[PDB]
Amino acid sequence: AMLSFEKKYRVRGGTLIGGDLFDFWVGPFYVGFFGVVGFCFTLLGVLLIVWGATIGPTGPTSDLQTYNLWRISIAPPDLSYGLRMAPLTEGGLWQIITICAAGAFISWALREVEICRKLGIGFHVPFAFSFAIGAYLVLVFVRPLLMGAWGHGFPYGILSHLDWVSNVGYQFLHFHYNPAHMLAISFFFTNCLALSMHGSLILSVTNPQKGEPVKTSEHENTFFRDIVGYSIGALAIHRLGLFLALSAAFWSAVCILISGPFWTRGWPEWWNWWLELPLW
Amino acid sequence: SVMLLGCEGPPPGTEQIGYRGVGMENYYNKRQRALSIQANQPVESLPAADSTGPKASEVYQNVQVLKDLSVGEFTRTMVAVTTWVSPKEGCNYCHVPGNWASDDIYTKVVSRRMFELVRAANSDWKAHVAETGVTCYTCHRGNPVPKYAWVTDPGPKYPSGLKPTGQNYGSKTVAYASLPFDPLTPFLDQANEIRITGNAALAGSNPASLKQAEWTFGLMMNISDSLGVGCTFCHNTRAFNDWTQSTPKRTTAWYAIRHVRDINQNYIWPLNDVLPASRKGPYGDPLRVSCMTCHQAVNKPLYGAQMAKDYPGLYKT
Amino acid sequence: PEYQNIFTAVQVRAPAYPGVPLPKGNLPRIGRPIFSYWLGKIGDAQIGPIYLGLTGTLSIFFGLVAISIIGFNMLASVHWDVFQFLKHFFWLGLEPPPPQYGLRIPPLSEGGWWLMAGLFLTLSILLWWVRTYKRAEALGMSQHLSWAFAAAIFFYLVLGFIRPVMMGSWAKAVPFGIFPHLDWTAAFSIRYGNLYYNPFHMLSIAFLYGSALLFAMHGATILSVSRFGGDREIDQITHRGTAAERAALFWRWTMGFNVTMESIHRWAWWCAVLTVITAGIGILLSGTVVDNWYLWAVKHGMAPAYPEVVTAVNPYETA
Amino acid sequence: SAGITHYIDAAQITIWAFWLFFFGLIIYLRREDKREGYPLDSDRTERSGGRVKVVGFPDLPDPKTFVLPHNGGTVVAPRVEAPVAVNATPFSPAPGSPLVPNGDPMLSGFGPAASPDRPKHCDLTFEGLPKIVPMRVAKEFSIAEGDPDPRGMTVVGLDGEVAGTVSDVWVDRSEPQIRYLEVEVAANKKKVLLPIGFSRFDKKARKVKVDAIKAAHFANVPTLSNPDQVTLYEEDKVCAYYAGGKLYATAERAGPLL
Amino acid sequence: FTMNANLYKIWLILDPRRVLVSIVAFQIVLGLLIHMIVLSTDLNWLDDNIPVSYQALGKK
Amino acid sequence: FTMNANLYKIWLILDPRRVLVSIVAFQIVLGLLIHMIVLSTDLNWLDDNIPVSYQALGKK
Amino acid sequence: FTMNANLYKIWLILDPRRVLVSIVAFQIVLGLLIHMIVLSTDLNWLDDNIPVSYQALGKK
Amino acid sequence: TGLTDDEAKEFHAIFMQSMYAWFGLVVIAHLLAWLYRPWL
Numbered sequence A: 001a002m003l004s005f006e007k008k009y010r011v012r013g014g015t016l017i018g019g020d021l022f023d024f025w026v027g028p029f030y031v032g033f034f035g036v037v038g039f040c041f042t043l044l045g046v047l048l049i050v051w052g053a054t055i056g057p058t059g060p061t062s063d064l065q066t067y068n069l070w071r072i073s074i075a076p077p078d079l080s081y082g083l084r085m086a087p088l089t090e091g092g093l094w095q096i097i098t099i100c101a102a103g104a105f106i107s108w109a110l111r112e113v114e115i116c117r118k119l120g121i122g123f124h125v126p127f128a129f130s131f132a133i134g135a136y137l138v139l140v141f142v143r144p145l146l147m148g149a150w151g152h153g154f155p156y157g158i159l160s161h162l163d164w165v166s167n168v169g170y171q172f173l174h175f176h177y178n179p180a181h182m183l184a185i186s187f188f189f190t191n192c193l194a195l196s197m198h199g200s201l202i203l204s205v206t207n208p209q210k211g212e213p214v215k216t217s218e219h220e221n222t223f224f225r226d227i228v229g230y231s232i233g234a235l236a237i238h239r240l241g242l243f244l245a246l247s248a249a250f251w252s253a254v255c256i257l258i259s260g261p262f263w264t265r266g267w268p269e270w271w272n273w274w275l276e277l278p279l280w
Numbered sequence B: 001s002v003m004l005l006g007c008e009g010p011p012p013g014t015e016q017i018g019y020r021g022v023g024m025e026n027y028y029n030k031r032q033r034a035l036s037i038q039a040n041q042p043v044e045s046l047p048a049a050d051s052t053g054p055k056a057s058e059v060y061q062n063v064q065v066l067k068d069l070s071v072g073e074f075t076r077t078m079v080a081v082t083t084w085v086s087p088k089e090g091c092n093y094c095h096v097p098g099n100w101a102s103d104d105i106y107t108k109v110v111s112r113r114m115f116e117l118v119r120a121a122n123s124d125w126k127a128h129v130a131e132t133g134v135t136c137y138t139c140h141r142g143n144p145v146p147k148y149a150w151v152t153d154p155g156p157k158y159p160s161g162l163k164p165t166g167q168n169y170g171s172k173t174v175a176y177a178s179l180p181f182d183p184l185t186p187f188l189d190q191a192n193e194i195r196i197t198g199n200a201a202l203a204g205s206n207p208a209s210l211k212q213a214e215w216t217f218g219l220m221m222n223i224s225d226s227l228g229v230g231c232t233f234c235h236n237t238r239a240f241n242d243w244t245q246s247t248p249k250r251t252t253a254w255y256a257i258r259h260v261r262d263i264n265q266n267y268i269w270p271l272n273d274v275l276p277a278s279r280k281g282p283y284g285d286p287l288r289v290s291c292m293t294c295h296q297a298v299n300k301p302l303y304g305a306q307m308a309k310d311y312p313g314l315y316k317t
Numbered sequence C: 001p002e003y004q005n006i007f008t009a010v011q012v013r014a015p016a017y018p019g020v021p022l023p024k025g026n027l028p029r030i031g032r033p034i035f036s037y038w039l040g041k042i043g044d045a046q047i048g049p050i051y052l053g054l055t056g057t058l059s060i061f062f063g064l065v066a067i068s069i070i071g072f073n074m075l076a077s078v079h080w081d082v083f084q085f086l087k088h089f090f091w092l093g094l095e096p097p098p099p100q101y102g103l104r105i106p107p108l109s110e111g112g113w114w115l116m117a118g119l120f121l122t123l124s125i126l127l128w129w130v131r132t133y134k135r136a137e138a139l140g141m142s143q144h145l146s147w148a149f150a151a152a153i154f155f156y157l158v159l160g161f162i163r164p165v166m167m168g169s170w171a172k173a174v175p176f177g178i179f180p181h182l183d184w185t186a187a188f189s190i191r192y193g194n195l196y197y198n199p200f201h202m203l204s205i206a207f208l209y210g211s212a213l214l215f216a217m218h219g220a221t222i223l224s225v226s227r228f229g230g231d232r233e234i235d236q237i238t239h240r241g242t243a244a245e246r247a248a249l250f251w252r253w254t255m256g257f258n259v260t261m262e263s264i265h266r267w268a269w270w271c272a273v274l275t276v277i278t279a280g281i282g283i284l285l286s287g288t289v290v291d292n293w294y295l296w297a298v299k300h301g302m303a304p305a306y307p308e309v310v311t312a313v314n315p316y317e318t319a
Numbered sequence D: 001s002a003g004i005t006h007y008i009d010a011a012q013i014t015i016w017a018f019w020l021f022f023f024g025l026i027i028y029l030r031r032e033d034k035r036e037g038y039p040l041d042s043d044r045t046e047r048s049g050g051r052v053k054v055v056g057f058p059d060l061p062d063p064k065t066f067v068l069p070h071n072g073g074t075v076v077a078p079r080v081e082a083p084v085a086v087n088a089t090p091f092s093p094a095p096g097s098p099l100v101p102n103g104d105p106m107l108s109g110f111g112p113a114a115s116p117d118r119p120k121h122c123d124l125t126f127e128g129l130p131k132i133v134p135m136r137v138a139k140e141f142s143i144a145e146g147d148p149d150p151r152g153m154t155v156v157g158l159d160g161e162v163a164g165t166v167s168d169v170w171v172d173r174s175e176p177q178i179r180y181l182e183v184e185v186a187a188n189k190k191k192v193l194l195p196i197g198f199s200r201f202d203k204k205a206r207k208v209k210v211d212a213i214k215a216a217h218f219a220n221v222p223t224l225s226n227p228d229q230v231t232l233y234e235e236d237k238v239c240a241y242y243a244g245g246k247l248y249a250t251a252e253r254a255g256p257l258l
Numbered sequence E, F, G: 001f002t003m004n005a006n007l008y009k010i011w012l013i014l015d016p017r018r019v020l021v022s023i024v025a026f027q028i029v030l031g032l033l034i035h036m037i038v039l040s041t042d043l044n045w046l047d048d049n050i051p052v053s054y055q056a057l058g059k060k
Numbered sequence H: 001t002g003l004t005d006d007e008a009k010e011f012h013a014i015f016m017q018s019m020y021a022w023f024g025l026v027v028i029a030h031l032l033a034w035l036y037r038p039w040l
């Protein structure tokens, strides 16, 4: 099964590892080396995540053990072990499962890599996706490492990983005062401000008023030049966006990292350096 | 504006407060904690006394509290006090050259109260102070006027009428936040309801104001930086008001929130009548007490330094 | 200038393009276009001209009043001491009217200026929305931007119009302050039992996230395909091209399915516009319909269960 | 989301109200996601999904109508497009398997080098002149005050060897920018256009580096009909040729690294 | 309208349509503003004092 | 009249469109920035002293 | 330079400056990584003992 | 710029009389208030 214009693109080659072997397409997907890899992590983890719902906080017969997607949770081991493997039951699952996350995320990127390698397109997507993965490598590896405990990670619970975000947040009082955190936020907002703007314009030029032709880039420019003056540019936005997106994550990564390993006091207070400046 | 990149370095302290992976964790700077302890050390207790001889009220004529004690013990409790309060100005601080019993110098008068004050704490408010207790040092730490004392903060400057907006200024009171920054007076001094977290699922039951919660947040901030910890310490942020979950400390502090009131409402406020100008705030109110006063940025004053135990005169007789 | 279609290596310039001809009644564009080598090294270099009619002028003047009022009071609290002004800027802010006024018009002192500068900022946006509507039809363009901007405005008014007024107190309104407004959202949550359990608030995040996600994909993809002219979406939407012709295959092979060059922009729209949609709601429900989203969740068996390794007593029931 | 409900309230009476609108909007989208491509071609791997179906969850939408501008035709979405051609053989009789390019993959016009037959016309500006044209016609366009001039630089190649020298660059009237480079191949002495996307600069040695194809490949690059304007048809078939290099310019590239 | 004589020359340099819209708008705000800045202070005529309290004879 | 001697040559380098427009703005904002700040100041006139509080009288 | 006798051949495969500078960094990141890892707790020569006591004694 | 000496001096003149138009109308303004509410 291929698209009206797929067949003429399914070329052989452009593989990183053992490509020729797994070099083929299963439905609308691609496999190759990394293709099989990720899968070997998917079920090996996805099922473990289910095994957690099965087992539960204490036991499968317990009253805590539930199957409500909301209440489901897979918390990491205590901070006692630090950088040690805790019993599969007492934190082990999380630890192992997480190792499957990196194997899924990273491979998924690597897989995208050669996938682009075949279409001779740019490696933008993967490189971009890297950040997302990188950000993850911070909320589970980097941070915990400089904190000396794999238990610093976040629980794998649809709603469970929100509390971990509330505590660690208040752990520094009003977590709204974090420099990197603020900055990052701005980006997330700008980004959304960009999408709501980009996507909108396109549809507003290719589907104008009734009895009207498809506008051209000639309009797009003027449009935003008549509401606020300047127009970033066609691909410019596709650049800007990509930027915001990544920047949003980057600055965020920093945001949490600095929180703890590089600062134990309360963020609201950090801003004091600006106050204690010999100028006021 | 700018983004932080590391004013403190790794690996920071760690203290697992809640169940594995609940977010409830304490992270403290290693070095800082060191310096804090070091510079925040007590004073070795004085040598034990004979505890015999005659009684205080026996020989000493003008004694209203330390009577129970003997001479050596009382002479001792007189020494300690001088080293803890005015080790700088000697005994002449709360007395008159010769008149070991005169009550002309205000420093004495208060000292009396302050005495009962302390005792009370150790004798009737043990759920808070525990079997440890507090001494004149805990607050005075060797200074006639406790460094960490407070007063009704005036706020920002007078725009000639619209000045009431007392929530726009980073006061060290609230950990450099932008809250009212003066929760000590309305709470630590008064008794304004701190609770605002609705106890019912749907609306129509709790009339609490949004500003109100900002106020509580205020106080909490201040408290948080007083003991020098993170809310995780007392609670699990997803249950700011569920006690069934929140932390033993949460309650312990509860009592203090009043032990402080007590200390201001029944001891520190009355003495204002005799306290001089430099001891009175702009609003005429006297320097009161706060969690910051004792704790001074340490969950347990002097890191659990048990001083009062070695001083029997510092307990209700 | 690393070329991954990141920075325009070599720029060129042509006579200032005074926009396209507008219809009858629409004032002629104004402003001598400017050129910036640097800025242009990011995207477009030419600047302006800009349109400014009734609605426009009426807007730029309107909201410019609110800003002044705000910045004014800010510099007012600091006792007009710029020194301490640029110092406490973040902290400084125009606080709302005290609860001791409900909705009644307070004196310029106790909350007045806020309200005033508020209505001037409320209409300033509502008016600006029309300003955009006038820039769309004047070019035969559609109103996808207004529709979105509307959605955003919706949530904007939820923070004052529909919710506060529905509560009967100007107290439940965000203040004019960089930092203090952070406390607002900080307090609001605390006041209503933790927005983490608030359904809509979550749904809205899925967008603040999704949004960032998509553009990270799109903005990127278009570039990766910028080689095969993937930036010129317009002529791609009309007559499909090679850019969009591989641009999809990628996603398809990667995630299974995919959409068209046009299609996607539609997803993006609904993934962004729906953000605030789930915003104004999640807040329109809070305070009025619900008061404690935590108990609300567990009420519906949402809130997860955690062992009890730590617990505190309750001096209230005891005493 | 629980299977059984014992609690009722307004908050929840609006939540489902959303999911319905959501489950609906996601479909609205899907429909649109099929205005280019579908129906599929084969059955290599029977459409995968929680619920198979003939052609996806949502039935194909109704053909939209696009009125191009003045002096233009009309486009419909979706549209019944005639089957294309594949200049490659199946690497294996097993479905999904790739198709090996016949002859010189550098010009086999398959995969990386493969490009659809775009309209054999040319894109225009708002008024009607060919949008993308050479500076030899753009009497107004000039190199940004300061930025180094490309016209005159020698276009190097993958292997490193020089392939030719730039004789002019193609600017864009509609959107001020440089989109192509009128390169003058040395071998064939012909004039082929070079796309920005593949065009790299080394202002130090006055060059336009290209890792796409070798210097020799610049020879047989899809020629243009009119040297005073680039046709959309060719335009897309142009920069596509370079793509091949991205995967054919060297046996090592297509070959595995580990 | 005496000085009107020499003032007529302004129309030759500035676009009349501008000074009109700029002002028709400028007054818009000023008006909405004054009643506001005033009603919020000197006399909140609407419901601060006179006439017969809508609260007294009203609420009861 | 003194300086007005050679000050005419000014318009020869500074366009009138410029001055006229900016001037209006400055004098507008500037002015409003006076009744404003000064208003907030003691010599307020709307609700400071007189008219002596009638609100209190008429209201109730 | 014992094994260095036949190890010269490794250069036809590995680029010259490629692994050259590719290691210059490696070293760096390692150095500070180690000055760092060691500093954290084992031996904190900076502040831990003497011949210091400059601030504790000096400041006081 | 954009003009010669002629048109220039003419503008300056009328432009002045219009400026003294303000100062006078504003000074007389201040004075009227100065009498009523004395600042300082």
Ligand code: BCL
Pocket (backbone or CB within 6 Å): A105, A132, A133, A135, A136, A139, A164, A165, A166, A167, A168, A169, A170, A174, A175, A176, A181, A184, A185, A188, A248, A249, A252, A253, A254, A255, A256, A257, C185
């Ligand atoms: C009391 C709580 C505090 C608080 C505490 C914290 C804490 C604590 C943290 C944040 C973090 C973040 N906070 Mg905060 N935060 C607060 C209030 C806010 C507010 C607000 C308006 O009030 C906002 C907008 C934010 C915004 C943010 C983000 C900038 C940041 C998440 C960044 C990110 O992009 O990760 C990007 C993404 C990822 C790491 C995940 C990786 C994605 C992977 C690779 C893909 C998964 C695929 C999956 C398996 C497949 C699904 C498909 C199915 C098969 C169908 N916070 C309050 C004040 N915040 C976090 C942060 O800084 O991170 C850097 C963080 O740790």
Ligand code: BCL
Pocket (backbone or CB within 6 Å): A046, A136, A139, A154, A158, A159, A161, A162, A165, C201, C202, C203, C205, C206, C207, C209, C210, C211, C213
């Ligand atoms: C970024 C800072 C915090 C964090 C803070 C928050 C906050 C705050 C919120 C979420 C929310 C969500 N987070 Mg989270 N989250 C973090 C890290 C993660 C990671 C990760 C791999 O690291 C994952 C997979 C998730 C997943 C999720 C989703 C369940 C939920 C929807 C978000 C969204 O719409 O994104 C945009 C993207 C998409 C819609 C597309 C793909 C996402 C899909 C729908 C989620 C699938 C996850 C699945 C249950 C995992 C198991 C898969 C098995 C194969 C079954 N979070 C870090 C630790 N997260 C929101 C929520 O409602 O939680 C209940 C919310 O409000």
Ligand code: BCL
Pocket (backbone or CB within 6 Å): A165, A166, A189, C063, C067, C070, C121, C125, C152, C153, C155, C156, C176, C184, C185, C186, C188, C189, C190, C194, C195, C196, C198, C200, C201, C204, C205, C206, C208, C275, C276, C278, C279, C280, C281, C282, C283
């Ligand atoms: C401790 C505090 C709580 C919390 C409390 C709140 C509160 C309270 C709210 C949110 C809301 C949101 N939160 Mg939250 N939030 C927390 C933690 C998080 C985290 C996190 C990772 O930890 C994340 C990712 C989020 C994410 C989000 C977003 C989904 C949502 C913001 C929508 C938005 O577009 O705003 C940006 C956009 C707008 C306000 C609209 C724009 C309107 C117009 C266009 C602006 C006018 C322009 C004007 C002219 C500008 C001139 C200015 C003048 C100078 C004055 N929250 C913590 C748990 N969150 C909002 C929500 O939707 O709740 C349901 C909200 O109200």
Ligand code: BCL
Pocket (backbone or CB within 6 Å): E010, E019, E020, E023, E034, E038, F020, F023, F024, F025, F027, F028, F031, F032, F035, F038, F045, H018, H021, H022, H025, H026, H029, H030, H033
């Ligand atoms: C402060 C204590 C006093 C008081 C003292 C003063 C004093 C003192 C002054 C005013 C002035 C003013 N006061 Mg008062 N005022 C008080 C209470 C009030 C109240 C009130 C509701 O209580 C109001 C509404 C006002 C209202 C006003 C304005 C009418 C006026 C501001 C003019 C201006 O800045 O133009 C801004 C300027 C311009 C737009 C441009 C310059 C004007 C030129 C000359 C004309 C333009 C020429 C152009 C090129 C030709 C084209 C024509 C058209 C533009 C198309 N006052 C109290 C009682 N008031 C000022 C005034 O009226 O000066 C005359 C002034 O000096």
Ligand SMILES: CC[C@H]1c2cc3[nH]c4c(c3C)C(=O)[C@H](C(=O)OC)c4c3nc(cc4[nH]c(cc(n2)[C@@H]1C)c(C(C)=O)c4C)[C@@H](C)[C@@H]3CCC(=O)OC/C=C(\C)CCC[C@H](C)CCC[C@H](C)CCCC(C)C
Pocket (backbone or CB within 6 Å): A041, A042, A043, A044, A045, A046, A049, A097, A098, A100, A101, A104, A105, A108, A109, A112, A125, A126, A128, A129, A130, A131, A132, A155, A156, A157, A158, A161, A245, A246, A247, A248, A249, A250, C209, C210, C212, C213, C216, C217, C220, C251, C254, C255
């Ligand atoms: C700066 C980077 C931005 C970004 C970009 C980005 N994301 C991307 C991409 C890019 C460029 C892709 O190419 C890729 C994609 O969609 O490819 C088709 C993707 C993607 N971004 C995704 C999600 C995602 N991105 C996010 C954020 C961002 N993505 C940033 C804004 C977020 C959040 C939290 O806001 C989420 C949730 C996925 C839809 C997809 C990647 C899918 C993938 O590679 O999955 C691999 C693995 C599996 C399918 C199996 C996992 C099972 C494991 C064995 C267990 C792991 C357990 C897990 C850690 C527990 C999670 C529990 C939570 C519910 C608490």
Ligand SMILES: CC(C)=CCC/C(C)=C/CC/C(C)=C/CC/C(C)=C/CC/C(C)=C/CC/C(C)=C/CC/C(C)=C/CC/C(C)=C/CC1=C(C)C(=O)c2ccccc2C1=O
Pocket (backbone or CB within 6 Å): C210, C213, C214, C217, C218, C219, C221, C222, C244, C247, C248, C251, C252, C255, C256, C257, C258, C259, C260, C261, C264, C267, D049, D050, D051
């Ligand atoms: C309780 C109960 C009864 C349960 C029943 C359970 C049952 C029945 C289960 C059986 C059903 C099963 C097992 C189903 C499994 C389905 C699975 C596993 C799917 C895996 C695929 C997967 C993880 C997909 C992730 C997709 C996600 C989350 C994408 C996020 C971004 C997003 C909004 C994408 C949608 C729009 C698209 C496709 C964007 C990509 C895209 C972008 C970004 C472009 O820029 C672009 C440019 C030019 C042309 C095309 C495109 C393009 O397509």
Ligand SMILES: COC(C)(C)C/C=C/C(C)=C/C=C/C(C)=C/C=C/C(C)=C/C=C\C=C(C)\C=C\C=C(C)\C=C\C=C(C)\C=C\CC(C)(C)OC
Pocket (backbone or CB within 6 Å): C067, C068, C070, C071, C072, C075, C115, C118, C119, C122, C156, C157, C158, C159, C160, C161, C173, C174, C175, C176, C177, C178, C179, C181
């Ligand atoms: C002196 O200043 C100078 C001249 C130098 C200029 C400088 C100005 C500066 C520096 C200004 C800075 C401003 C800043 C930093 C502002 C920051 C604002 C922030 C952070 C705002 C954040 C949130 C604001 C919100 C959510 C506002 C919501 C407002 C609403 C909902 C208003 C509603 C109003 C209504 C409904 C009015 C209704 C009319 C009546 C009341 C009559 O209906 C009964």
Ligand code: HEM
Pocket (backbone or CB within 6 Å): B059, B060, B061, B062, B063, B064, B065, B066, B067, B078, B079, B081, B082, B083, B085, B086, B090, B091, B092, B093, B094, B095, B100, B101, B102, B107, B108, B109, B110, B111, B112
């Ligand atoms: C070492 C120096 C000091 C000596 C020798 C000393 C001695 C004494 C003596 C003998 C008495 C009881 C005498 C009587 O009233 O008849 C007494 C009482 C008292 N002293 Fe001191 N004193 C010293 C320092 C201080 C200081 C620094 C303070 C102040 C904080 C202080 C506060 C008091 C008070 C308040 C009483 C009365 C106690 C009561 O009411 O029961 N003294 N002191």
Ligand code: HEM
Pocket (backbone or CB within 6 Å): B081, B085, B094, B106, B107, B108, B110, B111, B114, B115, B118, B134, B135, B136, B137, B138, B139, B140, B144, B145, B146, B149, B263, B268, B275, B279, B287, B288, B289, B290, B293, B294
């Ligand atoms: C029993 C031991 C204590 C003695 C003898 C003592 C003595 C005194 C004296 C003499 C003063 C007046 C100082 C002056 O201004 O000249 C004073 C003030 C004060 N004391 Fe104590 N005190 C004791 C314990 C405490 C404790 C435990 C606290 C802490 C809560 C405390 C808090 C204060 C405050 C807030 C003031 C007012 C500030 C001031 O007077 O300058 N004192 N104390």
Ligand code: HEM
Pocket (backbone or CB within 6 Å): A170, A173, A174, B193, B194, B195, B196, B197, B198, B216, B217, B220, B221, B223, B224, B227, B229, B230, B231, B232, B233, B234, B235, B240, B241, B249, B250, B251, B253, B254, B257, C190
């Ligand atoms: C900065 C982080 C903190 C925040 C945001 C916070 C917030 C709150 C809130 C909202 C309440 C009111 C709950 C209700 O409606 O009943 C509260 C109460 C309370 N908090 Fe915290 N808190 C923080 C840190 C702390 C810490 C560190 C302690 C411990 C020393 C503490 C002790 C208490 C106590 C004892 C009460 C009950 C007060 C009463 O009797 O009304 N809190 N907190």
Ligand code: HEM
Pocket (backbone or CB within 6 Å): B121, B128, B129, B130, B131, B132, B133, B134, B138, B188, B223, B227, B249, B250, B252, B253, B254, B256, B257, B258, B260, B289, B290, B291, B292, B293, B294, B295, B299, B300, B301, B304
């Ligand atoms: C209202 C503000 C105050 C709060 C919230 C507060 C809170 C607390 C808490 C939570 C603890 C237990 C710490 C732990 O478990 O490690 C504690 C201990 C203690 N507090 Fe306070 N406190 C306050 C004010 C004070 C004041 C004014 C004094 C001074 C006289 C004081 C003296 C002590 C002492 C001596 C201990 C040690 C008891 C022990 O070891 O368990 N506190 N306080």
Ligand SMILES: [Ca+2]
Pocket (backbone or CB within 6 Å): B167, B179, B214, C175, C180, C183, C184
């Ligand atoms: Ca506030």
Ligand SMILES: [Ca+2]
Pocket (backbone or CB within 6 Å): H039, H040
């Ligand atoms: Ca004066």
Ligand SMILES: [Fe+3]
Pocket (backbone or CB within 6 Å): A198, A202, A238, C218, C222, C233, C265
């Ligand atoms: Fe796009």
